[PDB]
Scaffold this active site. Sequence first.
Site, PDB file in Angstrom:
ATOM      1  NE  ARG A   1      48.192  30.168  31.685  1.00 42.15           N
ATOM      2  CZ  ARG A   1      48.823  31.337  31.827  1.00 42.15           C
ATOM      3  NH1 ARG A   1      49.766  31.720  30.958  1.00 42.15           N
ATOM      4  NH2 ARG A   1      48.510  32.128  32.849  1.00 42.15           N
TER       5      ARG A   1
ATOM      6  NE  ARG B   1      53.813  30.382  37.875  1.00 43.53           N
ATOM      7  CZ  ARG B   1      53.615  31.429  38.664  1.00 43.53           C
ATOM      8  NH1 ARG B   1      54.457  31.674  39.671  1.00 43.53           N
ATOM      9  NH2 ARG B   1      52.573  32.224  38.444  1.00 43.53           N
TER      10      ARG B   1
ATOM     11  NE  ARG C   1      31.098  31.069  40.669  1.00 46.11           N
ATOM     12  CZ  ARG C   1      32.390  31.018  40.337  1.00 46.11           C
ATOM     13  NH1 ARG C   1      32.785  30.347  39.257  1.00 46.11           N
ATOM     14  NH2 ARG C   1      33.293  31.646  41.082  1.00 46.11           N
TER      15      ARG C   1
ATOM     16  NE  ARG D   1      39.547  33.253  47.398  1.00 50.05           N
ATOM     17  CZ  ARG D   1      39.682  33.609  46.127  1.00 50.05           C
ATOM     18  NH1 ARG D   1      40.726  33.177  45.429  1.00 50.05           N
ATOM     19  NH2 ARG D   1      38.764  34.386  45.554  1.00 50.05           N
TER      20      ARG D   1
ATOM     21  CD  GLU E   1      36.325  33.954  48.136  1.00 52.48           C
ATOM     22  OE1 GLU E   1      37.234  34.700  48.576  1.00 52.48           O
ATOM     23  OE2 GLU E   1      36.231  33.638  46.935  1.00 52.48           O
TER      24      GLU E   1
ATOM     25  CE1 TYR F   1      35.752  39.361  38.508  1.00 49.55           C
ATOM     26  CE2 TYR F   1      37.455  38.878  36.876  1.00 49.55           C
ATOM     27  CZ  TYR F   1      37.085  39.309  38.146  1.00 49.55           C
ATOM     28  OH  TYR F   1      38.049  39.704  39.056  1.00 49.55           O
TER      29      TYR F   1
ATOM     30  CG  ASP G   1      40.820  40.715  36.904  1.00 52.95           C
ATOM     31  OD1 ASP G   1      40.120  40.306  37.853  1.00 52.95           O
ATOM     32  OD2 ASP G   1      41.680  40.012  36.351  1.00 52.95           O
TER      33      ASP G   1
END
Lengths: 386, 386
Positions: free
Chosen positions: B175, B179, B256, B287, B312, B363, B365
């Site tokens: 997508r 914004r 990974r 980051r 990281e 994965y 959350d």
Amino acid sequence: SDFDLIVVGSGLFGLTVAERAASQLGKKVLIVEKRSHLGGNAYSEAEPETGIEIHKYGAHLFHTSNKRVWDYVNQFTAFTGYQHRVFAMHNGTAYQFPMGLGLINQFFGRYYTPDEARELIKEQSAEIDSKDATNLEEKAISLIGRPLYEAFIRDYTAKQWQTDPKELPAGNITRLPVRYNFDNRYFNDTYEGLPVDGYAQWLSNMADHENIEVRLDTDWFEVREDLRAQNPEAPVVYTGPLDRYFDYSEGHLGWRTLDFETEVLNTGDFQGTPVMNYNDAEFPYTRIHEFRHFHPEREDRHPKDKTVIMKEYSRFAEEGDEPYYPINTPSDREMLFKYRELADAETESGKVYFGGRLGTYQYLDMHMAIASALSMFDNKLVDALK
Amino acid sequence: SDFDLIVVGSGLFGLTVAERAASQLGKKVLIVEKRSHLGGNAYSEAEPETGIEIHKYGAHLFHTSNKRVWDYVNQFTAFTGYQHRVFAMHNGTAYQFPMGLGLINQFFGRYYTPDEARELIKEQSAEIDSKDATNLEEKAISLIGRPLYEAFIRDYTAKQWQTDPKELPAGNITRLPVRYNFDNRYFNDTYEGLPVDGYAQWLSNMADHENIEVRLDTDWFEVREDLRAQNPEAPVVYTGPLDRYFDYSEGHLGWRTLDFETEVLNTGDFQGTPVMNYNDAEFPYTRIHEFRHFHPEREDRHPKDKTVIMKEYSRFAEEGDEPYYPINTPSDREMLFKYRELADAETESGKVYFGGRLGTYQYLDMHMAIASALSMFDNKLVDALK
Ligand SMILES: Cc1cc2nc3c(=O)[nH]c(=O)nc-3n(C[C@H](O)[C@H](O)[C@H](O)COP(=O)(O)OP(=O)(O)OC[C@H]3O[C@@H](n4cnc5c(N)ncnc54)[C@H](O)[C@@H]3O)c2cc1C
Ligand SMILES: Cc1cc2nc3c(=O)[nH]c(=O)nc-3n(C[C@H](O)[C@H](O)[C@H](O)COP(=O)(O)OP(=O)(O)OC[C@H]3O[C@@H](n4cnc5c(N)ncnc54)[C@H](O)[C@@H]3O)c2cc1C
Ligand SMILES: O=c1ccn([C@@H]2O[C@H](COP(=O)(O)OP(=O)(O)O[C@H]3O[C@H](CO)[C@H](O)[C@H](O)[C@H]3O)[C@@H](O)[C@H]2O)c(=O)[nH]1
Ligand SMILES: O=c1ccn([C@@H]2O[C@H](COP(=O)(O)OP(=O)(O)O[C@H]3O[C@H](CO)[C@H](O)[C@H](O)[C@H]3O)[C@@H](O)[C@H]2O)c(=O)[nH]1
Ligand code: NA
Ligand code: NA
């Protein structure tokens, strides 16, 4: 009797005193309100074409660190998790705001760390010591330097006060207006939000009690002799204009007013954020509000192709203007002191208490008006109504 | 019996299944956990020098639109009103992020309205049709244009995947990542926050039940023959690695991993925000996290002059590395399909159920792991435990 207490004005101060007498003391309260609605300046309404909730007497953002006040208002409305954020338009760019690492990066052209930004502000503001500042302009520069002052403070301040900042008191700025992080929450208070079903519903709920009678479209000064003759022992809480109550016998207190120019636009989104400050002198208004963005949780009832905006203009209040902010010139401060002695005498002889923004010549946020009413209730009215 | 159910692994999936069996079915549950603590990768701990809450297996941000999951987790911890926000460091400037009117103003040099920004994105991305894109780079450019892609997506993506984006599937972007307003809330979910007393306390609370026994420092494969001999009818919920369970008989699934370099600095504030992405190739890390800013409500227990940061780094998981994210090459997808048939047979013959990130090669959350455990409980375990 038909009432035990009369309250003049249905702003947050009047509503709080009325509701506390009604529910805590079981007293009959008559609220007299000059306008055609409850709520004073906090009142909101649907714009007819779009249905969007708008304000006619200024946008109202609720925030407080006073837990008693927060617990109190949540009896009458739930609040959204809205957090107020503002952007500042300067020379064709929308800056993150208030001044912080974001604005600093955008304005000075590269990223400064918190410690680097502290050092930058020290360099920029080295020019003037705050202890030596003789007016607002110097005080501002003594704190943040000339480039920042001239870009984000000078013209906005000039437009709001209709005065050159060199002619304003150094006392208008009392702390460093710069954050050394990326936090752009506009307010710093513990609790914050907007009434879930709007202000009109909240304020109507406060007045919705078996012991409360409300008379709208009624000027106290036109009905007071009749009302008090029905029950002479009933105290009055007056929240109308202090100087007008005493027939301007000591002069007219000076106020600033605002003009709002409200437009419906044929786009779904004008600026992508609730409030955009216009910091440059070439724009006559200080900021634009886009009301749909205060309630993003209502997006599927808002139109997809229209939006309501409002431009805000500041000036001195003349006859017929809504008085919004006390000007507080030394001349104002001294006729205020005279009126306080008249009011204090009137409380003693006539059981008329004076409160609220207009009744005390003092700007009050909603939570501060509520805290002040709660105090008057606790410390004056409970005894006066026994 | 001493237990009615065995759960292998104490991540959010294992804890949820254990707690539901314990409290809803009144069953005795034995949790077997290989590490020296509960909670799997969601676990957090105090950094010793500063006391600041940190993570050793990735920063964890809780967010969900699943009301059942939200109501469930709030039985075990309260959540702060933390809202995640991210900034992107590119060519020496910290950009507002994700892509929106803020970044667009900063990057293209002046303010674009929502409608002007939509028009800009149409112009920029005109080059390639998304329907014609053959890889990630083209798909990205087909959506947002080359300048934005090359500044904020290319190198970050390259660092994370250790691959040229020209060699990644067009299916990785599904997508428009732009914004057309100033909203920089990172997540879009209804509910969001961080556990008030930290993750370790939350996850410990889930396991704190009279019916739950926890054995830490215990590898299932070393104790399973003994445990099942005590009660052969007890089902097992296994959340360890799927390929390892079947002795890698169909190959090694590819993952990974991440390296975290954690430092205590002699400043109170390193970057003024919780997370700063480093989008340029010259920085090897993707980051930096600064952990104190995840809990600003704890500022008066945090040191004034020290802070903990963490860089990281991403790479392929080799022997001895923590497996974090499934790679999902077509080779991986096909040995996964083989393992699913082995697992399904093992459930039928041995009453061993497979779940969680490691147990299903997927994965998840935290809220998705919880939803998945709630489903397995509802649809499989209630019947298996009767
Ligand atoms: C432009 C503007 C913006 C504001 N924005 C915020 C904001 O964002 N956040 C915030 O917390 N606060 C805000 N406030 C303040 C907010 O309106 C407070 O609720 C208000 O100051 C409370 O004081 P009050 O109840 O005395 O006043 P008012 O709201 O002024 O109510 C007084 C009432 O008395 C009535 N009255 C006056 N004379 C008579 C009479 N003779 N007879 C009968 N009735 C009479 C008036 O019609 C009015 O309804 C704003 C105020 C203004 C003006
Ligand atoms: C780097 C990273 C960042 C993340 N960030 C977020 C985030 O911001 N937000 C979010 O919602 N989710 C996040 N997640 C996901 C989060 O960790 C989930 O809670 C997790 O994926 C849930 O899956 P789980 O319970 O199966 O897994 P795990 O957390 O991996 O738990 C599995 C447990 O099984 C144990 N185990 C394995 N083999 C054996 C064995 N042989 N015997 C005994 N015990 C064994 C392991 O030691 C571990 O404790 C992140 C995950 C990672 C890796
Ligand atoms: O871009 C800006 C904004 C503010 N100021 C300075 O700050 C003063 C006060 O700022 P604002 O009046 O714009 O805003 P406040 O933070 O003082 O208060 C705001 O929040 C209130 C709610 O608590 C009310 O809604 C109020 O009308 C609204 O201005 C200005 O006169 C000016 O001196 C600037 O120089 N530049
Ligand atoms: O600055 C950026 C950020 C992201 N991406 C693209 O977006 C992909 C995914 O971005 P991230 O992995 O950085 O972040 P997510 O939004 O996918 O997920 C984040 O939130 C999760 C919680 O739901 C976990 O915390 C996770 O580790 C954290 O990366 C990247 O591979 C890359 O292709 C960029 O190009 N540039
Ligand atoms: Na100075
Ligand atoms: Na395109």
